[PDB]
Design a protein around this nucleic acid. Sequence first.
DNA 1: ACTGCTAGAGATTTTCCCGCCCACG
DNA 2: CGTGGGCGGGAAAATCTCTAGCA
DNA 3: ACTGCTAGAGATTTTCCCGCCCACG
DNA 4: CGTGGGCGGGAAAATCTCTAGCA
Lengths: 28, 270, 264, 52
Amino acid sequence: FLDGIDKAQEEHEKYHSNWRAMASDFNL
Amino acid sequence: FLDGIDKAQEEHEKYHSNWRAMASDFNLPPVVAKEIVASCDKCQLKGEAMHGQVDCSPGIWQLDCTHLEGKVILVAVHVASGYIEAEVIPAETGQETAYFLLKLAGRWPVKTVHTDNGSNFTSTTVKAACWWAGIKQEFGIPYNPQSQGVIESMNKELKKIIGQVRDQAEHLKTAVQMAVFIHNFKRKGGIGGYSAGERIVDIIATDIQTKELQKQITKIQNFRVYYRDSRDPVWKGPAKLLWKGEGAVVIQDNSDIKVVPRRKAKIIRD
Amino acid sequence: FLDGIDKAQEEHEKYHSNWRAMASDFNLPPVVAKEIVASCDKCQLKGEACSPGIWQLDCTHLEGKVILVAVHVASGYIEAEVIPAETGQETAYFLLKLAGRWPVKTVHTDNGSNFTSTTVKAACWWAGIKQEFGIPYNPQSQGVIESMNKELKKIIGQVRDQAEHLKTAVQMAVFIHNFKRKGGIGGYSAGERIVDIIATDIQTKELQKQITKIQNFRVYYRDSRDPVWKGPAKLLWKGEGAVVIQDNSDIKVVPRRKAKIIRD
Amino acid sequence: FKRKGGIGGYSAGERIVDIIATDIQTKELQKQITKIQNFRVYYRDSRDPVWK
DNA sequence: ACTGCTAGAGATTTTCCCGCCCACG
DNA sequence: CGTGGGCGGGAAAATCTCTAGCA
DNA sequence: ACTGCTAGAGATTTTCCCGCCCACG
DNA sequence: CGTGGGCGGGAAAATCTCTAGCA
Ligand SMILES: C[C@@H]1CCO[C@H]2Cn3cc(C(=O)NCc4ccc(F)cc4F)c(=O)c(O)c3C(=O)N12
Ligand SMILES: C[C@@H]1CCO[C@H]2Cn3cc(C(=O)NCc4ccc(F)cc4F)c(=O)c(O)c3C(=O)N12
Ligand SMILES: [Mg+2]
Ligand SMILES: [Mg+2]
């Protein structure tokens, strides 16, 4: 794959986000 | 007095023995053994074992200075939500911390500060600024950094994310701003999966909703509760009804928040 | 509960109130209120283009010293910062500070030389902020920005004897404009409006993030006195005894034993 | 405005204001405040830092 | 292929004893 | 007039926990 | 009059789902 | 030949616990 997963990967590249933040913000 | 008890005392004078040793060697009750243990002024133990409670009120903010790469960093943290804020200080002095506190008071509803007993946090400029802004000052135990440890844990977290974020930026403080942005917004979890930036909204939203609803309801609902207390027949009152229960109401007579049963109660309209 | 939906529908036909009024008044789940406000014809206004990220930027030069002023224009909140030297790095630093405190989504400014640096472009690329140059979002508050700057200069003319340095009096002035200026509909100084706007935006974007995964899902359902598995209807509220769905245009309730939820 | 009598000594336009004020107080506002002040409170007790 | 551990203090639960008194022989 | 049993009040014993110190 | 506290990792318990197959309409 | 319900196997979610570090 989804585009939200790829944008969560960009979020991980910029901020090293939590797993729950990426799961909540993109329904993962 | 038995002679073995006096010789137990002399044994404690020579060796500072256990209470169980004097109990077993002379067939003694443990009360007199712990008395003889308490008798010696050198037989003093390691203290008591329980932790205190740090206050959790929305008007309190913790503040502390820390050190990294030869620079001083001023951190302030709201206690209930964990919303953080940090800056690099030019020099450790009370006037720049007073300027930081004035920025904090201008941006947030701050009522009471609580720091340690450092030199910069005891300046006359900080006292004059807190008198100008009407901020109650408070300090902790002079040699106990544990009451203020909640901001130290966040300093640890801040430097840990600073370790993750130092390579992206040239200067230190740019990465510091990026890190405080990351922790205030990007880091989720805690109580209900939110960042601290949402809880600091929700706490003040409940603050400027619930007590205003309470002020609107306290002028309308005014019930006078007379109560027959336990072990007695005296109908005492009147008390202010806080909330009507199903089998037990809650009231306040003068200062006692009491859960008095409704069968032992009597509610008057005015 | 379920019989108030039609009297919310005729209410939205006569008066066209939003989902919050029909949700809080009729004690409904807000998803059926958002679908009632969604199914209307003349209640379909514009999109986002409201915004909590309405932020005006304006520079001034007072006492030969630069003051950069930001305004949260959705709530009328305003603050500023004393800047020593006019460069894009200072504006990017202040913009990253504003992004760290509040969720800055869009900024409105002019085409000034200090605000057009590539450092600010890299900062807003790392932040993800829509940017406007010279374009007002709406021309009502356009003069009000300048009038608030003049109001803050009047507050500076009040409190210049309250502090020695420029920025200390500036912080006292923004404290006064945050708290010592009352009025309005319910006596809000400056912060209660912006925390109300931010709380409502957070709640409605949580509702958007909740509902954006439900519309992918399918509910195949049969009825009571029926074995014909109809669908796939759209889920509104998953319940323990009754599940709310919509098949074509009707808000229906179903037993969970008659339900079948596709996970994608 | 200027013909005052009755119980409380008001005129007509003031008595109707006080009467409909008491009416809108006792009509729905008490029930509205008592049905909105139910909330969610997290807390901890003494000698234990685990919030409940 | 190696590894955190141990003495003491309230605190709290679990359990005999005694006296006693109310219920019975 | 001569016993029994539970209770309750108190002592006292086993365990929970928990803490600070070893640099 | 003051007060230890907080983010993360296995681990363990609690709980939907699905498919299926054995028991039944 | 046409359905229902428990089971089991697996996912997955809420909580227990426990530690590292703040000089
Ligand atoms: C010169 C050798 C060479 C190898 O390294 C050093 C350093 N060291 C450090 C501690 C120490 O930190 N004790 C306090 C402590 C803290 C935590 C914990 F879990 C256990 C603890 F004992 C010692 O006791 C010790 O003997 C030594 C030592 O001998 N040496
Ligand atoms: C110069 C002021 C004057 C007063 O005394 C000093 C010394 N100090 C020491 C620590 C420290 O050891 N933190 C680690 C830690 C260890 C155990 C625990 F339970 C809690 C903890 F935070 C600080 O954090 C700190 O800020 C200070 C400080 O500021 N000062
Ligand atoms: Mg300190
Ligand atoms: Mg410290």
